[PDB]
Write a protein that binds this ligand. Structure first.
Ligand SMILES: [Mg+2]
Ligand SMILES: [Mg+2]
Ligand SMILES: [Mg+2]
Ligand SMILES: [Mg+2]
Ligand SMILES: [Mg+2]
Ligand SMILES: [Mg+2]
Ligand SMILES: [Mg+2]
Ligand SMILES: [Mg+2]
Ligand SMILES: [Mg+2]
Ligand SMILES: [Mg+2]
Ligand SMILES: [Mg+2]
Ligand SMILES: [Mg+2]
Ligand SMILES: [Zn+2]
Lengths: 350, 272, 40, 48, 57, 198
RNA sequence: AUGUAUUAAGGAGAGUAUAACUUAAUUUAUGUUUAUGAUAGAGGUUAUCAACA
RNA sequence: AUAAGCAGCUCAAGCAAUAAGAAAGCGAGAGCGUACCUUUUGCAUAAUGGGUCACCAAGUUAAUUUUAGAUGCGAGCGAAU
RNA sequence: GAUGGGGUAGCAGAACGUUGAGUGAAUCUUAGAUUUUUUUUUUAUAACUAAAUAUAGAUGAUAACUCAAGUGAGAAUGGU
């Protein structure tokens, strides 16, 4: 009214639009701060950083939204993280490799990265909201980003009758993390396990679209530097992603494959036998070489823990902490490429 | 119409007040409108209640506006969850009953409250009938009154017939729980009313008695009154509370032989 | 409280108590406790 | 230029347009107190 | 007393072993079926039989 | 209590209690949704400063320009804009009775004037103060020539003349500003009879 | 509390229309102004619907 | 429920948020610490006073006589006309 | 790369708070003034942020500066 004039002038058709207009990005103090908070290059205008915050659930047009920008950025993130794991840990099993990727470039970490940037969400999308807010509608899950996986003809039976799905095929059919493909309104309600997945998905597409924007404006090297600064900089203990089943058989199969002497468990130390909390220190040898060692309060557990640590040492072999990546050869003026170590594959045992 | 301003009037004035009640009774008179009145003669029409049930619509309308806005702020939040209290209020019935003023003290009535605490209404009534205390007769009367308000106003203890058919015909096993004190129970009717909470409160002073002692000394003795408050609930509450204690114990993880106890002191060097 | 002469309000709540327990009447939530515009 | 009120904050986040439809649907006042009038039960009895 | 008794020590003296014991020695009357005390007569049937033997005898 | 009831209904939902079936409130002795006879009839004696305020719009307590038989309109409370006819007028508290069905309200009848077979609660017409009503009278529109009802906000006495021998008083009432003398309503004089003891 | 004006003997008992005060405990009259006041009705117990002198 | 705390302080395991995010509080165990005021050369003192809480409760005012600072006028000042 | 730092009797300086008053016929308040709580932050006897509860348009509250005091209580076998 007369006493409460509007703070930000807006035409009457503003609320009708799904997302704020591009020119509105030039009057938002949240955008300008976000653009500088990330030290983005001035080549990326504010109208482009604003487009990275509009999810396809808020604006269904192919433009004005995150769809295409996020797809390009996802391909860059997944690529730079994939080649980086195979050069730092070339012996990781395929299952552990899928979890390592999902632990860096998955919806969970990207949600934490988007929040690390100070990006607040809009309650409900519309042309009246601040362009500096992440816009999306968690009530509409009918939006999905394009990927490179295919739908399995037995997906219906995979979920109902618990049919078996192998690992070798997840590289061709499933998505980049091993997940199968294709797995008025009233706001008087509470959250849902679906709205959380829709919100977590929106934050992920934003972080991806930012990488795609840098690639479109700055170039390839700038995108790799951004991924290498905010994603690869995170910390992850891959040893905690391992879950073994009969590790004593897998270690016996490993020694047999590499032609090592059969593994023999030996008691290196012990104390408290016939007590409530003993300590048996068992070490597994292949001849005279000590492969792994584990200390537990039982003889069997100490033998299993020793075999698990022996298998982790094999899988967690690392040529270096900061190894060269094949992507470095695209940057002109680089030294000749030295062949990397290619492992045979994880051991398959009874 | 006051009790004292009723006899100081003439039969002319008094007969007109009787005529007014007569025409009022005629206006109140098969089934469509019969549901608009209670057995006590309370007309359930909005016009006849608005002045007592909605005395301040200017404030109720603004209070509702507050609760509606508070509800949409939670609906737009994808991470919102229904609070535990708001979920229990709309699922579990409850009656808070405060007795009248009993001619006794807190130190005396506290022991009768602690006796019926946690028991069923049927068990508590049996313990009051055969108690040597004088207030046990009053507690029994007040406990029957509370059980009447729990059944009529709140709708508690109205699934016994449907309970027996569900179990006896089916042949299933009833629910076995364990209260917070550790007592084991086997619940066959989840609607059975029980004493969930009970506390005693101090009331107004019944009277004053003068105690005349030697050497001409006089002391005032206070005759006390106290009230008891009982919270009645159904067995659904004891089942839920039991399932929560079980889940909490299962969530605390198992006991390990070699725990990774932390070293709390930090020093700027290696001691090993 | 044991000696209070039971008034007409007490006699009415005891009659309904027998109706709900016997099954003559099915209990329903209140509708005139408060006049809210939400009606929920 | 003026004070930022809770209404303006809702408008920035986009929630206000959702609050109007609900309050209007329930016939509740949006930015006001309505046409109900002030408490009179004590006034009619002679309260001062 | 030299000092005022604290809340902890007076609650101990009042509650520790001073709980009211529940009466469990109950059974039913063989003539009416009402709850009564074990080895005791029914107070309802007593008065009723006491009066029945007063009218006709 | 209405603050506690509105919140309870909002939280419980399908478990909302049936308060209409509960016992009386001993603090006052009233049933649910029922007033007191003293509060529904407004039989409370008010200050002489309050009496002058209740009729400030219709003259003075001793010069009253509103009489039984006038059609008034409520301007306060829940039943605003309600038009009715005055039945009786109490000059001690300066209240008025409008026998309208919408003005009926539940009332708790005391037991010293009720049989054991009658119902405790009943509905009676509620009284209102004179300050919460205004006169409704048809006035001829001079430019159009048709009669429509209007609300009179203020009245004042005019042409007052006393008769000391009879201790009587006769005056007129008019609307200030427009100076429209409004006739009095047709009132029936009390019936005086000759008794045998006279 | 101070100031201004006026005045120059105070209390109790019992009774009574419980605002009305003396077994008459609500006496009987005069004049003026009465909504432009003062500062064309109803109403004698359903009372005192009038203030000043 | 194996313990000899003016009940605080230093160190601190653990428990604690149905869920993304968010740990207030309680605290096992280790150590340090003998209330307060008054009055005294000197008080944990077994010297004084207090059952607890809330409220009431003590250098003020007047006249007179001075000093400092500030400030008006100035061999005059003030007051009053 | 200034100097100084325990404290009773006692002397001195600088401030806060409480009650009322002036500016004040001022400023602000259902777009929530005020709510004895809780909470958050700030070198902090104090104020502030937010939350919950209720609902006032002034017989409401209030910054800053200033004026005046029935102005600050764990201590009087103090009083109620
Ligand atoms: Mg004597
Ligand atoms: Mg006449
Ligand atoms: Mg122990
Ligand atoms: Mg001692
Ligand atoms: Mg002492
Ligand atoms: Mg003492
Ligand atoms: Mg004081
Ligand atoms: Mg003082
Ligand atoms: Mg020093
Ligand atoms: Mg010092
Ligand atoms: Mg508050
Ligand atoms: Mg004291
Ligand atoms: Zn018997």
């Amino acid at each position: 009214n007369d006493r409460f004039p509007p703070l930000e002038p807006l035409p009457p058709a503003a609320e009708s639009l799904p997302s704020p207009l591009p020119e509105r990005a030039l009057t938002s103090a949240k955008l300008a701060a976000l653009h500088a908070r990330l030290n983005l290059s001035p080549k990326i205008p504010l109208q482009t950083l604003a487009r990275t915050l509009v999810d396809a659930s808020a604006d269904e047009n192919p433009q004005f939204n995150n769809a295409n920008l996020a797809f390009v950025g996802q391909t860059l993130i997944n690529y730079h993280i994939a080649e980086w794991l195979l050069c730092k840990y070339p012996r990781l099993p395929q299952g552990i490799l899928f979890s390592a990727m999902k632990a860096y470039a998955g919806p969970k970490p990207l949600l934490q990265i988007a929040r690390s940037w100070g990006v607040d969400t809009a309650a409900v999308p519309g042309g009246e909201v601040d362009p500096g807010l992440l816009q999306f509608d968690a009530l509409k899950p009918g939006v999905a980003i394009t990927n490179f996986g295919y739908k399995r003809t037995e997906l219906a039976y995979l979920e109902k009758f618990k049919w078996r799905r192998g690992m070798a095929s997840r590289v061709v059919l499933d998505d980049d993390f091993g997940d199968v493909v294709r797995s008025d309104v009233s706001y008087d309600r509470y959250g849902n396990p679906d709205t959380r997945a829709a919100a977590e998905r929106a934050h992920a597409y934003f972080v991806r679209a930012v990488v795609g924007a840098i690639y479109a404006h700055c170039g390839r090297e700038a995108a790799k530097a951004f991924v290498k600064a905010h994603i690869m900089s995170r910390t992850l203990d891959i040893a905690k992603l391992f879950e073994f089943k009969y590790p004593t058989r897998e270690l016996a199969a490993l020694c047999a494959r590499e032609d090592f002497e059969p593994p023999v468990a030996r008691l290196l130390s012990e104390t408290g036998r016939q007590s409530r909390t003993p300590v048996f220190v068992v070490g597994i040898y292949s001849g005279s070489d000590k492969l792994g060692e584990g200390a537990a309060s039982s003889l069997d557990h100490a033998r299993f823990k020793a075999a698990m640590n022996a298998l982790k040492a094999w899988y967690l072999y690392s040529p270096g902490e900061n190894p060269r990546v094949p992507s470095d050869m695209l940057e002109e003026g680089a030294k000749p490429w030295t062949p990397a170590y290619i492992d045979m594959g994880e051991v398959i045992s009874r | 119409w006051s009790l004292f301003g009723w006899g100081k009037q003439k039969v002319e004035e008094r007969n007109k007040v009787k005529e007014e009640l007569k025409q009022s009774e005629l206006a109140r008179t098969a089934a469509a409108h019969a549901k608009d009145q209670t057995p006590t003669g309370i007309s359930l029409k909005k016009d006849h209640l608005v002045r007592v049930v909605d005395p301040d619509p200017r404030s109720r309308v603004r209070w509702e506006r507050k609760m509606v806005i508070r509800k949409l702020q939670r609906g737009t939040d994808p991470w919102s969850v229904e609070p535990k209290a708001e979920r229990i209020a709309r699922t579990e019935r409850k009656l808070v009953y405060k007795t009248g003023y009993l001619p006794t003290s807190v130190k005396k009535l506290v022991h009768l409250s602690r006796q019926i605490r946690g028991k069923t209404v049927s068990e508590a009534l049996v313990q009051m009938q055969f108690s040597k205390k004088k207030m046990a007769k009053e507690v029994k009367t007040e406990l029957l009154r509370a059980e009447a308000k729990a059944i009529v106003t709140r709708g508690m203890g109205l699934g016994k017939a449907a309970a027996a058919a569900a179990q006896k015909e089916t042949g299933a096993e009833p629910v076995k729980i364990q209260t917070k004190d550790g007592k084991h129970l086997e619940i066959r009717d989840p609607t059975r009313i029980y004493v969930a909470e009970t506390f005693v409160n101090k009331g107004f002073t019944r009277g004053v008695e003068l105690d005349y002692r030697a050497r001409g000394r006089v002391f005032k003795m206070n005759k006390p009154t106290t009230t008891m408050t009982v919270v009645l609930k159904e067995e659904k509450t004891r089942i839920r509370e039991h399932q929560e204690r079980v889940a909490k114990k299962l969530r605390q993880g198992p006991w390990v032989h070699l725990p990774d106890r932390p070293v709390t002191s930090q020093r700027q060097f290696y001691s090993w | 409280p044991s000696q209070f002469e039971v008034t007409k309000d007490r006699k009415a709540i005891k009659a309904r108590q027998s109706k709900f327990l016997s099954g003559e009447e099915t209990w329903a939530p209140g509708k005139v406790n408060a006049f809210l515009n939400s009606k929920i | 230029p003026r004070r930022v009120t809770p209404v303006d904050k809702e408008r920035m986040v986009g929630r206000w347009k959702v609050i109007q439809k609900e309050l209007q649907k329930r016939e509740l006042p949006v930015l006001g107190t309505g046409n109900h009038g002030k408490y009179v039960e004590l006034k009619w009895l002679g309260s001062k | 007393p030299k000092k005022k008794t604290s809340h902890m020590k007076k609650r101990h003296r009042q509650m520790a072993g001073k709980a009211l014991k529940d009466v469990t020695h109950l059974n039913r009357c063989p003539a009416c079926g009402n709850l009564k005390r074990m080895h005791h007569l029914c107070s309802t049937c007593l008065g009723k039989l006491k009066g029945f033997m007063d009218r006709n005898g | 209590a209405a603050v506690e009831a509105r919140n309870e209904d909002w939280m419980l939902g399908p478990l909302a209690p049936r308060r209409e079936l509960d016992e009386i409130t001993l603090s006052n002795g009233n049933f649910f949704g029922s007033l007191s006879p003293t509060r529904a009839l407004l039989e409370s004696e008010v200050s002489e400063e309050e009496r002058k305020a209740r009729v400030a719009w219709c003259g003075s307590p001793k010069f009253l320009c509103i009489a039984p038989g006038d059609r008034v309109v409520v301007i306060e409370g829940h039943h605003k804009d309600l038009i009715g006819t005055i039945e009786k007028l109490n000059t001690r508290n300066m209240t008025v009775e409008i026998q309208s069905e919408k003005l009926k309200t539940n009332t708790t009848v005391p037991q010293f004037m009720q049989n054991d077979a009658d119902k405790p609660v009943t509905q009676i017409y509620a009284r209102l103060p004179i300050s919460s009503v205004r006169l409704v009278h048809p006035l001829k529109d001079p430019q159009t020539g048709e009669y429509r009802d209007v609300i009179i906000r203020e009245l004042r006495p005019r042409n007052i003349v006393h008769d000391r021998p009879t201790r009587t008083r006769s005056m007129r009432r008019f609307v200030p500003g427009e100076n429209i003398i409004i006739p009095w309503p047709k009132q029936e004089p009390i019936k005086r009879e000759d008794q045998p003891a006279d």
